[PDB]
Symmetry: C2
């Protein structure tokens, strides 16, 4: 809290705040009153008389960003570090500004979270003086410290449970393939699970959605038009999965009996469909906590050993698998 | 764009910006460079050389707030008025500040939108010098200009289609009853539709949810425990309706065949369940447009005649009714 903070708050100039502070007798009584109340309310002391991290995540409101922020928050409380958090609505030329907004507010470190981490973001993360560590976000470049689950393995495990259940024809509905989470991790996890059981990797069992429910609807439809129809489908995110489920249901198919579906992220939506969606669970609270610790390690100039941290994931088996 | 705007943007004082503007020769070249670029980028002219409205709505992102903002926006473009829009996440002691943030940025008028309009908000809306008009929001007090649908009638019409379909035992799952939209409008609409067909108004057919999906689940469950089970249910919002649908489905009941359900607001969610949700549609784009016109009328000191404007609603009949 400084003169500047009082001025903004009292809709007045720094020089006026100083004037009031100095007991200048020609300040309009009302403005003097206004700024003294501001001075008191903010706790501004007129006598010259710590470590914070900036956090950027898509939105405050989303439940799975919310246990990440708590994980971040709880480490901050213990460590006596303050949090500056900003809800971004993750977009390219608006998460970048919210990044440099942290740098211009004297943060000692940055925790960053975005679904699509651009190559452009990395070139500005390296120039950033303070250390930064990604939470539940991956850049295939692997220069920037990251703490996440093992997306490839989680993909593998999801498709594995389909395989273990007797399915030979198993499809994958992806978010945009250009993103590493998809082409570098989930696609490959899905592929590996197939090849390891001597199953066929068909290009036409990999359909690309756009993360919307509808693209999910379109994806099952396209899959159901295939010669040998898939009898199970892994879906890269929950929102698409509901679309996958409902399009199947619209085509007269039963989930799980005619078609088994598995999702990802264990969002609120996974329990807002019938059958409820089997979905890969990330430990968002832990990812936040560990991110905060990893960030601290760098900030404290400590030898990290391993900059890419991978936490266990699990699968909440619900009714969309049998 | 003023000296102040350049200063904030160039992370520098007004006096420094003036110094650079005046060609003061002892300003550090780099800071002179920094502020000249800021001056150019913002379009600041150093020579002394219109009507805007503030808009407060829960969030930018939500599709049904998004055709309201477009309706607002399109009237603004025509009228050559600029929009200052703020996403609130509608809460009591945070929508109030975002209201006075408009007043402190010299807006000529305010369009306000919130699910729960508090009595406290009205006492601060009257003191506000510039005129304000509520969009898709109601204060039972009816002092403050409002443009909305006819909630009572829309409720009536929803329950009417159940009645017309042969249902005698019809329940209502409400959002919190304390809010006028519910107790003063939808409850009464629901009641009227019953009494007008000589049907019974049972206290136990009115259950109170909290706008969550889950409270919806709990509400059907409680309804299904009744002696004479309702065979149709009106639900005050879509989110609760999905909960209502799924709890019925979980109890082995078919929607629409064992239980007909109707929702409200025609949110994205209404088409993200099976059966798709029959739901009252508001014309959000029109409510925004008309709100903007009504606001203009007041701002132009024009004789309004009728401060409470009610627009037609309709019902998107989907599969949750037969
Ligand atoms: Ca087709
Ligand atoms: Ca019970």
């Amino acid at each position: 809290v400084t003169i500047y903070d009082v001025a903004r708050e009292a809709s007045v100039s720094m020089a006026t705040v100083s004037r009031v502070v100095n007991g200048n007798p020609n300040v309009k009584p009302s403005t003097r009153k206004k700024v003294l109340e501001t001075i008191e309310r903010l706790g501004y002391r007129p006598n010259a008389v710590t470590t914070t991290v900036g956090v950027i995540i898509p939105d405050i409101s989303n439940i799975f960003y919310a246990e990440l922020a708590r994980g971040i928050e709880d480490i901050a409380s213990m460590y006596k570090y303050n949090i500056i958090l900003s809800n971004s609505d993750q977009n390219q030329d608006k998460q970048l500004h919210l990044l440099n907004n942290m740098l211009g507010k004297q943060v000692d470190g940055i925790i960053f979270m975005s679904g699509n981490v651009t190559e452009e973001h990395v070139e500005e993360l390296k120039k950033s003086p303070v250390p930064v560590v990604l939470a539940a976000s991956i850049e295939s470049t692997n220069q920037i410290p990251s703490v996440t689950i093992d997306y490839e393995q989680a993909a593998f495990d999801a498709v594995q449970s389909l395989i273990d259940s007797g399915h030979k024809n198993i499809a994958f509905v992806s978010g945009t393939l250009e993103e590493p989470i998809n082409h570098a991790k989930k696609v490959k996890g899905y592929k590996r699970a197939l090849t390891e059981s001597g199953l066929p990797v068909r290009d036409s069992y990999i359909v690309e959605g756009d993360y919307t429910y509808d693209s999910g609807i379109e994806a099952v439809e396209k899959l159901l038009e295939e010669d040998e129809k898939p009898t199970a489908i892994f879906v890269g995110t929950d929102e698409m999965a509901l679309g996958v489920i409902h399009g199947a249901q619209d085509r007269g198919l039963n989930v799980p009996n005619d078609l088994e579906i598995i999702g990802f992220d264990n969002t609120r939506l996974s329990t807002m469909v019938r059958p409820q969606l089997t979905s890969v669970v990330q430990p968002m609270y832990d990812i936040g906590a560990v991110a905060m610790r990893l960030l601290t390690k760098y900030m404290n100039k400590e030898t990290v050993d391993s900059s890419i941290v991978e936490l266990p994931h699990r699968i909440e088996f619900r009714q969309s698998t049998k």
